[PDB]
Design a protein around this ligand. Structure first.
Ligand code: ADP
Lengths: 81, 642
């Protein structure tokens, strides 16, 4: 009951994934970052695949710049590395 | 004390030992035995351990007289260093303390660090124009800079060094640590820095078992206190340790029960169940580790090459499958095992590297876990998180079993004859069954071509396999007897592995040769016809054929059989076929992963795909891939600039 009440008050995931180990959920996080990682796939894959909203993909491509998943030498054009 | 009398006593004991030296003139040293001197003159041999400063000097001048007096006397009286290789007691690096200072000791261990061939001046003649030219202030190579404050002859202070008349000698400083084979029980890698002189320099490499016997000297490196700050063993003689002392020994009463255990039925099943009894399942992984412990025969061909005799294992899987625990139980079960992590906690944590010492700033070659465990095992946990320097040298240490470093003024090659039973974690958190192994593994694709066994300890939810592991963990926590205890005790099994890796050397038989041949040709043409008009898949490579023979000989050595029985070669096929499913089979067809990938499809699509608003549409109606697949294809192409 303590373990059950802990998982409920945390809301760790929809399917109860162990986000405490990877800091990512399979459905809402791992599936999106797997499909995400001129600008061919930056504009096309964001539309025909329906990966997410404009604000949702913006934070993912931003975090991809730090982890090394999206590289863009120039500001006008952005690419995925 | 009675130095002149000791010279006469040394000359009395000195003559068959000096007789062969009288023949060989270029020999610049003389190997003298302490037990021989103890038989001739026990009181003289006792002074060797008590006052080694006056004993070595008096013995050198004494044997010089025993050299010039008889015939065949050399013209130039070359320096004859008294090398006492044998001693009545053998000390340990951990047992060594401040009590044995200025005493002739014989400490055993393994060399980890070593310096270059640094020349040092023996007779430091200082050039003083005013006066006092040939004056010598005898300095030792480890000692600090010696400089007189004033000339006693004329009172001048114009002091300088005369390196034209100075007689320089060779000098090398190494680090002797505890042997990880047996002295690792103390769990303290204590070190005693030692020095080397002429005929001792370049006499041993790092990661080698040596038995040094010298005088324990001291050095006042710091001026913060009058007492010494660091002790340095002045090595008088160096010698590599014998085989019996550097290998596991078995009692004669145990040699009978080890042979009795070999005659016991289902010996293979007993050893598999005896390896990590706490963890549930993974019997294929347990048998694969068992084949790695009883490594194959290592033979050398007369053509110069040496056939490999090790089987490296890699345990890839999601977190929570007790893949790190499997590297623990084997760490204590294996005879010579160094349990370590992939994290580069030191400059030479994984592979031997070069680092400048803190004493004189000179680069010293420090060994690693793949060097100290030579002729043994090295269980590397978290193999996917390694430094770039270690990742570049493991490609050679796993196949050629050599580590050739030629940087930082240190050029040499080591012997990395270790069985790397490693375990890596996927860089995506959990391993996906829809992607190949190097796609989710941080290890390079060429590095995977070295491991003979790669098991996938994946986590799969199933009511049958989860209810068994749940009740098994409960039995382990409850303290159940048969749930934690092995069928073969760890103490006896540790000797059983050393007995097989030393005495039993199986040889291939005609029955097993036909089984290895029929299996290799059976895999051929398994999937090559599939990917026609392009890169045809190679289901099995000749590299894996050598790995199959190593596993077939591993199963014969585990049974303590001097021949590879047809049943032994069949057992290695099941383990290979089981790994096939993990990689290169039962996944993207055969040839999967291989060197880099199956290519059957990926490579095939690569050649077809090979201001870009037109090329995205061109790939659409081409039908080579869906809009989602052709999207992810160019992300990997943009990664390499394509
Ligand atoms: N077959 C098994 N039997 C018993 N315990 C297991 C088994 N598989 C996984 N475990 C459990 O997994 C937990 C973590 O093990 P660990 O060695 O840390 O795996 P990893 O390092 O991959 O996370 C342990 O508490 C252990 O009890």
């Amino acid at each position: 009951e303590i373990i059950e009440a802990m998982m409920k008050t945390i809301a760790v995931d929809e399917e109860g994934n162990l986000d405490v180990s990877i800091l990512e959920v399979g459905k809402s996080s791992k599936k999106i970052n797997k499909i995400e990682k001129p600008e061919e796939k930056v504009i096309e894959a964001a539309k025909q695949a329906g990966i997410g909203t404009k604000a949702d993909i913006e934070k993912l491509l931003n975090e991809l710049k730090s982890d090394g998943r999206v590289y863009e030498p120039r500001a006008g054009f952005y690419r995925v590395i | 004390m009675d130095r002149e009398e000791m010279i006469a006593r040394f000359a009395k004991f000195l003559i068959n030992r000096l007789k062969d030296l009288l023949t060989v003139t270029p020999k610049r040293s003389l190997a003298i035995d302490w037990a021989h001197l103890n038989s001739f003159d026990p009181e003289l041999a006792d002074e060797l351990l008590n006052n080694p400063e006056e004993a070595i000097a008096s013995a050198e001048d004494a044997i010089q007289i025993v050299l010039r007096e008889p015939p065949l006397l050399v013209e130039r009286e070359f320096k004859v260093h008294a090398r006492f290789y044998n001693l009545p007691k053998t000390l340990l690096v951990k047992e060594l303390g401040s009590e044995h200072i200025n005493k002739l000791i014989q400490v055993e261990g393994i060399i980890t660090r070593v310096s270059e061939v640094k020349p040092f001046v023996e007779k430091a003649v200082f050039v003083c124009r005013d006066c006092g030219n040939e004056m010598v202030r005898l300095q030792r190579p480890y000692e600090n800079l010696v400089k007189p404050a004033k000339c006693d002859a004329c009172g001048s202070r114009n002091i300088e060094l005369d390196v034209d008349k100075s007689r320089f000698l060779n000098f090398q400083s190494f680090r002797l640590q505890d042997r990880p084979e047996s002295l690792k029980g103390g769990q303290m890698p204590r070190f005693v820095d030692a020095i080397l002189l002429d005929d001792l320099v370049d006499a041993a490499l790092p990661g080698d078992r040596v038995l040094v016997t010298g005088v324990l000297r001291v050095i006042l490196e710091q001026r913060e206190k009058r007492p010494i700050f660091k002790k340095i063993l002045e090595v008088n003689h160096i010698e590599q340790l014998s085989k019996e002392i550097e290998e596991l020994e078995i009692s004669p009463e145990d040699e009978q029960k080890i042979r009795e255990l070999a005659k016991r039925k289902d010996i293979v099943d007993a050893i598999v169940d005896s390896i990590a009894p706490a963890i549930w399942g993974h019997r294929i992984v347990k048998k694969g580790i068992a084949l790695a412990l009883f490594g194959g025969v290592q033979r050398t061909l007369p053509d110069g090459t040496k056939l490999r005799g090790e089987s490296h294992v890699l345990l890839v899987g999601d977190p929570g499958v007790a893949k790190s625990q499997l590297l623990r139980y084997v760490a204590n079960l294996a005879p010579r095992a160094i349990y370590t992590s992939g994290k580069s906690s030191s400059a030479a944590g994984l592979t031997a590297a070069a680092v400048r010492d803190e004493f004189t700033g000179s680069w010293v070659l420090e060994a690693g876990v793949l060097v100290l465990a030579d002729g043994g095992f090295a269980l590397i946990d978290e193999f996917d998180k390694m430094s770039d320097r270690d990742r570049s040298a493991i490609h050679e240490a796993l196949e050629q079993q050599t580590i050739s470093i030629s940087k930082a003024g240190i050029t040499a090659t080591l012997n990395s004859r270790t069985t790397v039973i490693a375990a890596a974690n996927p860089k995506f958190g959990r391993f996906n069954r829809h992607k190949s192994l190097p796609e989710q593994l941080d290890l390079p694709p060429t590095l995977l071509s070295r491991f003979d066994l790669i098991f996938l300890l994946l986590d799969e939810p199933d009511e049958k396999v989860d209810a068994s592991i749940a009740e098994h963990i409960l039995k382990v926590r409850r303290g159940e007897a048969e749930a934690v205890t092995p069928k073969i005790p760890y103490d006896l099994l540790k000797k059983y592995i050393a007995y097989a890796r030393k005495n039993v050397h199986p040889v291939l038989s005609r029955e097993a040769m036909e089984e290895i041949k029929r299996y290799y040709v059976k895999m051929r043409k398994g999937l090559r016809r599939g990917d026609e008009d392009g890169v045809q898949p190679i289901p099995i490579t000749a590299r894996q054929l050598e790995a199959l023979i190593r596993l077939s000989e591993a199963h014969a050595r585990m049974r303590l059989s001097e021949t590879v029985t047809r049943e032994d070669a069949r057992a290695a096929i099941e383990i290979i076929e089981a790994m096939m499913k993990t990689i290169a089979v039962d996944e993207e067809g055969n040839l999967d992963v291989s060197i880099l990938e199956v290519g059957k499809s990926s490579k095939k699509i690569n050649k077809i795909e090979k201001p870009e608003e037109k090329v995205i549409e061109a790939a659409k109606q081409a039908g080579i891939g869906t809009k989602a697949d052709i999207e992810k294809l160019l992300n990997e192409l943009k990664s390499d600039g394509r």
